[PDB]
Structures are given as C-alpha cells and as structure tokens.
Amino acid sequence: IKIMKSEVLRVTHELQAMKDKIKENSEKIKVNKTLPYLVSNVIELLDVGKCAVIKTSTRQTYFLPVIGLVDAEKLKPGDLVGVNKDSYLILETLPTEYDSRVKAMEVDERPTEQYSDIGGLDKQIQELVEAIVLPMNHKEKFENLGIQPPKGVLMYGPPGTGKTLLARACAAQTKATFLKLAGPQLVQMFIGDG
Amino acid sequence: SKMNLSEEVDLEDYVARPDKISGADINSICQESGMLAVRENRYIVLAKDFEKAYKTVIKKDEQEHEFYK
Amino acid sequence: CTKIINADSEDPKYIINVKQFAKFVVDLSDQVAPTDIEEGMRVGVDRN
Amino acid sequence: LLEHKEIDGRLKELREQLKELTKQYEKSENDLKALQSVGQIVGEVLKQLTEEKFIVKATNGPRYVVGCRRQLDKSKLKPGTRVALDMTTLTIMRYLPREVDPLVYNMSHEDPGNVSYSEIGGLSEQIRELREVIELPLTNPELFQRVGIIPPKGCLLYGPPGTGKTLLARAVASQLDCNFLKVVSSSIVDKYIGESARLIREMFNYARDHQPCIIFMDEIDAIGGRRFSEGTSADREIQRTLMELLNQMDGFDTLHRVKMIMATNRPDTLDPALLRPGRLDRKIHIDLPNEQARLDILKIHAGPITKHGEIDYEAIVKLSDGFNGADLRNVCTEAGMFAIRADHDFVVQEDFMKAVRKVADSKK
Ligand SMILES: Nc1ncnc2c1ncn2[C@@H]1O[C@H](COP(=O)(O)OP(=O)(O)O)[C@@H](O)[C@H]1O
Numbered sequence A: 001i002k003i004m005k006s007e008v009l010r011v012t013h014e015l016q017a018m019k020d021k022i023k024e025n026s027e028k029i030k031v032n033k034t035l036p037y038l039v040s041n042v043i044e045l046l047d048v049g050k051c052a053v054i055k056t057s058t059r060q061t062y063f064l065p066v067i068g069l070v071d072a073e074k075l076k077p078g079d080l081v082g083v084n085k086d087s088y089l090i091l092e093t094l095p096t097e098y099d100s101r102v103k104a105m106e107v108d109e110r111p112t113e114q115y116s117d118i119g120g121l122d123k124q125i126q127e128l129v130e131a132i133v134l135p136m137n138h139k140e141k142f143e144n145l146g147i148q149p150p151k152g153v154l155m156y157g158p159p160g161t162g163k164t165l166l167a168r169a170c171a172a173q174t175k176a177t178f179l180k181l182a183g184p185q186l187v188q189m190f191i192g193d194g
Numbered sequence B: 001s002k003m004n005l006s007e008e009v010d011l012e013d014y015v016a017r018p019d020k021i022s023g024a025d026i027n028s029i030c031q032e033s034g035m036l037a038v039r040e041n042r043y044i045v046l047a048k049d050f051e052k053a054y055k056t057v058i059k060k061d062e063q064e065h066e067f068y069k
Numbered sequence C: 001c002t003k004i005i006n007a008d009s010e011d012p013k014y015i016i017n018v019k020q021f022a023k024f025v026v027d028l029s030d031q032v033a034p035t036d037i038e039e040g041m042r043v044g045v046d047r048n
Numbered sequence D: 001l002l003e004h005k006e007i008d009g010r011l012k013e014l015r016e017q018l019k020e021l022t023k024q025y026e027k028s029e030n031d032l033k034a035l036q037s038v039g040q041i042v043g044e045v046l047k048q049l050t051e052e053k054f055i056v057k058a059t060n061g062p063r064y065v066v067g068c069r070r071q072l073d074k075s076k077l078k079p080g081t082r083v084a085l086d087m088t089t090l091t092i093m094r095y096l097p098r099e100v101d102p103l104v105y106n107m108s109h110e111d112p113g114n115v116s117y118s119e120i121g122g123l124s125e126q127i128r129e130l131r132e133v134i135e136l137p138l139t140n141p142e143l144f145q146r147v148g149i150i151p152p153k154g155c156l157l158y159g160p161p162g163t164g165k166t167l168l169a170r171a172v173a174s175q176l177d178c179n180f181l182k183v184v185s186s187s188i189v190d191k192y193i194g195e196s197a198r199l200i201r202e203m204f205n206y207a208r209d210h211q212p213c214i215i216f217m218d219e220i221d222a223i224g225g226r227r228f229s230e231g232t233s234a235d236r237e238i239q240r241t242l243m244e245l246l247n248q249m250d251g252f253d254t255l256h257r258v259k260m261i262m263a264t265n266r267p268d269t270l271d272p273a274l275l276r277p278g279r280l281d282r283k284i285h286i287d288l289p290n291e292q293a294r295l296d297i298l299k300i301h302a303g304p305i306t307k308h309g310e311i312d313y314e315a316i317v318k319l320s321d322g323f324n325g326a327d328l329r330n331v332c333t334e335a336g337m338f339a340i341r342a343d344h345d346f347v348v349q350e351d352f353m354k355a356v357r358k359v360a361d362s363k364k
C-alpha cells in the first residue's frame, strides 16, 4: 500500500509543476496572440488534418497548413477570421458580415400586431395559425404520425385585401423574423435573381 | 476489330442497308451490341442482339402526321 | 469603423476598414473611451 | 483493504480526472506547433523551365521563377497546378488541388440523401437500363474491356415533370457512393457573355479531378437546343454553351470515369449533335406510370405513414389516373395531413380517398 502512496506523492508533484509549465505556455501563447489581428475571408477548407486557404483584406491569397489557434470544425467557407499580421495564423474567428441585399432586406423585427389589426379574415388567420404555429408547437404530435410538418403556407387574393397584414400579424404572434421579399422586383435585376 | 467474333453475321448486308448513319452511329451500334451481350450474359454477339442494337440506334422514329407526306 | 463585436469591456475589438489598404480588428487607446466610439465614424488608427 | 477502500482514497481523483490538464497540455502543444507555422503563399505553376526552375504566378500578384522542395513529386507539377509557396524563400512548398468554382462547390456539396433503390417503383426496365449504362462501367470495367466496347459516356432520361428522373439519378448516385454534381440547366446561364460556358468547363474540370463522378444536368432542354442561326445575342450565347458541353463530353480530351445523366421534359427540341451518339449514347423514356407502376409508387410511398386496419392501393390506382409520381406522394402527404384534421395518430381508408380527391382537384 506504500508504493501507491509514493505514486500519489509523485503525481501531485507532477501536477504542481506542470501547472506552472502550462501557465508559462499560456503566457507564451498570449505573447503571440497579443491584440492587433488582421481580418481575412476564409475561401475554403482543404483536407490534408484540415488546411484552409484565405484571402486577407490586403488583397492577398494565402494557404495555411494548420488552422491557427482556434477550433477548425465549423469554419464556414466565408467566415471572417482574425489572422496574424505577420505569420498569418488564425488567432480567432469573428462574427459574420452583411451580405448586401439581406442588410438591405429590412427585418422590422417588431411588427406590432395582436390580431386586432386584421379584421374580417377570421377563418384565414385561423388557417394560418393552424398551418404555421400549431405544427410549430405540436411538432411532436406530427412526428408521432410519422409525417413532416408543412414547410410553407400560401395565400392568394385581390390586391389590398390584407395579405401582408396577416403575414405581419403572424410574425408578431410568433415573434418570428420577418422578411418582405418582393414579387415584381425579382423578375428584373438581370439573370442572377435565383 | 476489338470486338468479339460475330459468329458469321451478315456484316456486309448490314453495311449494304441504305441508311444515313454516321460513323458515330456505327460505333453506337457496336456499343449497343456489347451492352445487349452483357445484359443477356453471353460474350459472343450474334444476329439477334446485333439486330436489336441496330434497330435501337437507327430507330429514326417519325410518327409524323400523314397529311405532311 | 464597423461592427463593435460586442466589446462590453470583454471584447474591446472593432472591425475597421483602412481605406484601400485593408480591414483590421483593433483595440482602443488609453486616450479614447468606448462611449465615444461606435459603428460608422472616422477612427484614427495608428500605424503599428 | 486498510487503506485500499477503492484506490487509496486519493488516487481515484489524481489518476485521470486531475489528468484532464494533461489533455489541456496536449491542446497547448497543438497551439505551439500551430504557433511555429508561418503560412504559405499560394499560386499556380505556369511552366517548367528546367528540372528545377518553375515559373509560378501567385494569385492577384506577381510571377516568379522558383524551385521546389527537395522531396516532392516534380512529375505531377503540371502547368496550371495550384501550388503553395513559402512566404520568405519563395519555393514550391506543397501542391494544391485545383480551385473549385463557388457555384460548382455548392452544386457538388449537396447531400443526395442516400436514397435507396426501393424508393422509385414501377421503373424496373428503365432503372435496370440506366444501372447498366452508368454503374456497370463503374463496377466491372474489365467486363466492358473484354466484351470489345468502350463504356458508354452517358444517357438521357426524358419524360413528363414529376416522373422521378431526378429521383432515379439521385438514387443511382447514392448506390454508387461516388462524386455527384447535381446541376439544373437554366441556372448556369448568366447575363455575362462568357460565363455559362466557363461554368460548364469548371463543372467538367471538377468531374475529371474527382473521378469517379456523375454529372446530373436537369432541364438540359435549356442549354441544349437545336442550334439555329438568326437568334438574339442570348440565343447564340446558349448555342455557345451547348457547344462547350458537347466538346466537354465527346471532345479532343476523352472523358474517363465521368458518367453524365441528363433529364428533360422536351427531348424533341434537343440539338441533333447533342442527340447524336457518343455524347448521349442512350435515350430513356421515363414515361407516365402504368397501373402497376402507379400501385408500386403508392405502396413504396405509403411506408412511413402509419396505417390502421385496412389500406388498399388498387382503388386509388383506378381512381387516380394521370398522376405521375409527385401527385401520388402528394396524395400520401395530404392523407397524413387529413389524419390530423380529425386528430388521429394514424390514417384510414376514407382518409386516403379524400386526400386523392383533393389532389385530383388540384390537378385539374
Ligand atoms: N381585413 C382588414 N382589416 C384591416 N386592414 C386591412 C384589411 N385588409 C387590408 N387592410 C389594409 O390593407 C393594407 C394591406 O394590404 P395587403 O393586401 O396586405 O397588401 P398587398 O395586397 O400589396 O399584399 C394594410 O394597410 C391594411 O391595413
């Protein structure tokens, strides 16, 4: 029973010392990972065990055998990364960026409706609720049936009959992000609005 | 030439049939012959699968309404 | 300057687009404070 | 057992759980060897001046004459091969696979969904034929080599929309478990004059780089169209694209282990050169299902739906003529939807009747 006690003593000495060496490693890590990072747009990830090519914001395209000091699993092909100013290693990843039209595609997250704004469409809003939010909260009862929930509702009617208002009302009652994609605008803008 | 032996099929008569078929169509006829031979599991082509390949390739289906001609 | 990247004294970093040179992600200076720096105004960054 | 209760009362925690910080040291070591890296300039080799001096052009930058690493396969560093350069000494550090076009990337990295062959139904002759023409060269090429033919390069599946040509090709890809480019024609056309043909070139270059591969181009009726004179700028641009597709299939550079599947609803308008053999060696009629095919589609698509008591298919078959396959799957899905209007956890036969009735009315 003595040898395991000696092993406990030696392992606690090893722990006590390699705590200090791991802290020294952290200090040197920060000595490289200091502060003035340079943002780059990850073009793609390549397998070698993953390598990524990047386009730094200084209009230069570089290859990385190892993915910096950050994880390398999500690493979306387009995720902005803070790469080293000189050795160009990915110190850390940053939040995403605007994609032009989507920023132009206003959210208007608070549509401020309570179904007291829409009137005369009681059957219509009941159908909308039962088609979108009722399956949303009883998706369990849906997979019990072994069928998939409806992935999208459709409406039709003469212009100015409240089709957009009901959409805003559903967005309000579900607190769901609203995007007002246009219909006649998309037919133009050249080939590419697909 | 690279094909298997054709067990004495009338290749000269197949040639003699008047049909506006290009060299690509002849290559297709031979390729179809090989496919049919593989499908029915026999390595030596004969007149049956060669003929079926010929009909398949040069089908030239028209169905055109009779009033045109 | 650009997105504040949730500084809140825990991530005092911002995306800044140095004209045609490049974009970078930089900290503050002892002179400046977080309050007067937000998105979109003209930020005078150093050269090192 | 005096001090050996479980293990010494203290080793139980010291041996492994307080050795998690050894795995943290391992993480720190990975960080260290990532620190030591410096990254590499990437460019494309342009020419082989001699056994060592290579002309290399860096992307969006200047070109250099550079050497290569001591241990490297020089015999493969062909002109145009994307390569990596050391940032300081500017030597060929390592090779890179050819850069993939972003639209080609998104078109190639779509999951087929590993759909089995059972989920097609009523296509036995056509599925057997396409299985032959595509997969037989991909499984036993020596059989074709012995028989005396070159493996056919691809085929066409024509039929009414909803007949499952896309499904059949998607299933072929899943069975083969090979690279699969699922592109839709009329989505590769571009306003810019020379971009659609370039996209076709990039598609086939990826296909050659990633053998074995099956390019499924849907709606080939879009790009492929009897080339005709006159024509607006667009008409001609599409001809130019068809001309690239043609040369990229049967052209000077022979295709290998890259089998194409093309689906269309209007085979009659396809160009005779495209319709000629060599490029599309087979034309497959995926026609509207017969009664047997219809009942097969219903039975294979009624699987996931939970049935109680009695569910027959021949009645739906004789009462649902004209439905291709999508209409029948719609019938099944609409029956599942009908199931929760009256709040069942199952389906009934009258439910299937009213579902197919609604689907038929929508068909009208
Ligand atoms: N039933 C209704 N109750 C109250 N307002 C309505 C109703 N129907 C339409 N509106 C008014 O019409 C406008 C919405 O028109 P809508 O039909 O949604 O637009 P569009 O036809 O362009 O899609 C809103 O200003 C809304 O107040």
Ligand SMILES: Nc1ncnc2c1ncn2[C@@H]1O[C@H](COP(=O)(O)OP(=O)(O)O)[C@@H](O)[C@H]1O
Pocket: D119, D120, D121, D122, D123, D160, D161, D162, D163, D164, D165, D166, D167, D168, D263, D297, D301, D324, D325, D326, D329
């Ligand atoms: N044998 C079949 N024929 C036709 N459609 C089918 C068949 N089996 C299943 N389907 C249904 O048809 C859909 C396939 O659509 P798709 O392949 O795009 O048709 P198309 O090839 O005519 O465009 C699937 O969602 C599936 O539910």
